[PDB]
């Protein structure tokens, strides 16, 4: 548990439906959502691989569970069920205990995906932006659509806004 989901970001966004993780920017030009496509695609690939690993790693053979025994062979019968029930027990203890664990793991995975996304932009904005809580930032300068597009892309160009940000922050 990394403290990003149900942590410093209390709730999710219903309006951002085309991804799992995203940004919400607010400018003079306007406000808007933008899902992060790369992280969402990587997470989708991971979840798909996990589901396929759970599903397609059980290859069985043609068997016919079920045998007929008369009165004169009860031990025989009592052995057969001891096999059958036994197998069921194992599977019923594995599958039920399997899903649970991966469920937890999945709920950790998404959390990490959010947390890293919060860290990456932090390392990009530095002192040029101030954390206002709720897991997001307020800029010390004027960011147009180009600035926020660059922040989302991964190339903020910190030095260019450094001096105005310094002038506005030292207040």
């Amino acid at each position: 548990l990394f403290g990003a989901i149900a942590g410093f970001i209390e709730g999710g966004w219903t309006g951002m439906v085309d991804g799992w993780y995203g940004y919400h920017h607010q400018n003079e030009q306007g406000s808007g959502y933008a899902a992060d496509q790369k992280s969402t695609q990587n997470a989708i690939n991971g979840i798909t691989n996990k589901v396929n690993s759970v599903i397609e790693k059980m290859n069985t053979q043609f068997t016919a569970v079920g045998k007929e025994f008369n009165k004169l062979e009860r031990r025989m019968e009592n052995l057969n069920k001891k096999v059958d029930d036994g197998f069921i027990d194992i599977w019923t203890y594995n599958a039920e205990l399997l899903v649970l664990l991966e469920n937890e793991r999945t709920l950790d995975f998404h959390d990490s995906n959010v947390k890293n996304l919060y860290e990456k932009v932090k390392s990009q904005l530095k002192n040029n932006a101030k954390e206002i809580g709720n897991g997001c930032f307020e800029f010390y300068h004027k960011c147009n659509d180009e600035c926020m597009e660059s922040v989302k892309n991964g190339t903020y160009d910190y030095p260019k806004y450094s001096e105005e940000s310094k002038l506005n922050r030292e207040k």
Epitope: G15, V17, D18, G19, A35, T40, I44
Partner: antibody
Framework: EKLVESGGGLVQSGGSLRLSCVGS????????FTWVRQAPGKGLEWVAT????????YYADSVTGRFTISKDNSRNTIYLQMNSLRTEDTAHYYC????????????????????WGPGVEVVVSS | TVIQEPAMSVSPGGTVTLTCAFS?????????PGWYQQTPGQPPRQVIY???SRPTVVPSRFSGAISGNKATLTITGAQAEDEADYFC??????????FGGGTHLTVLG
Amino acid sequence: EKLVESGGGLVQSGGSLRLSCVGSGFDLSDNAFTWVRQAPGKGLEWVATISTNGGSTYYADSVTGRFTISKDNSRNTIYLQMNSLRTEDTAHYYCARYKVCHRYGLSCYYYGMDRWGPGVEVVVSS
Amino acid sequence: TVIQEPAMSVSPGGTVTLTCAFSSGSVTTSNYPGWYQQTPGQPPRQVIYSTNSRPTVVPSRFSGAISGNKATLTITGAQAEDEADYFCGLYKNSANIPFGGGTHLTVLG
């Protein structure tokens, strides 16, 4: 299910246009849309896209900050407001509708565009 | 980026193939290679979506597949109404679908 495009023409450099596309035969509330352009002597280039509910919006790196794609569900219309047009914006513009895909509860952009529009020729000059 | 061939030709009733490849990589089924047909004066039409899936309306002369890390569109028995520009749209982890330059198929008459 057809898309009809309109609102383009000859505009001066530094001006603005508002291309509009009207869809007849379906509802826009559950489909994602895109605007694509073909420059003269060049291949098809992605311009902008809007999600199913209109919340998410993505722009090409060359037209960011100048183009705004919006959706009006009441009129069944998709608008591309183009501002501060430059000479490189001369093209033929198509409005296309993304095919419906649903991956783990999320809307997709995998399969491409199923319904395109006839296109509108936008030319700028000085 | 996506690379196609500038122009190709086919005689009527002849089978032709159009290729679509990345400039610096390979094209797999996860790229969802779509094929769009564009005639002059009319909207482009999605001939192929996904690797091989074809819409009902589209004739069955058009089939597609991934061969040699390259998407391919095969037209078996090219009629006279298949003289258009064919564009290949690939998927790269975003709504930004890169398109090919275009291939002008000339049905010789």
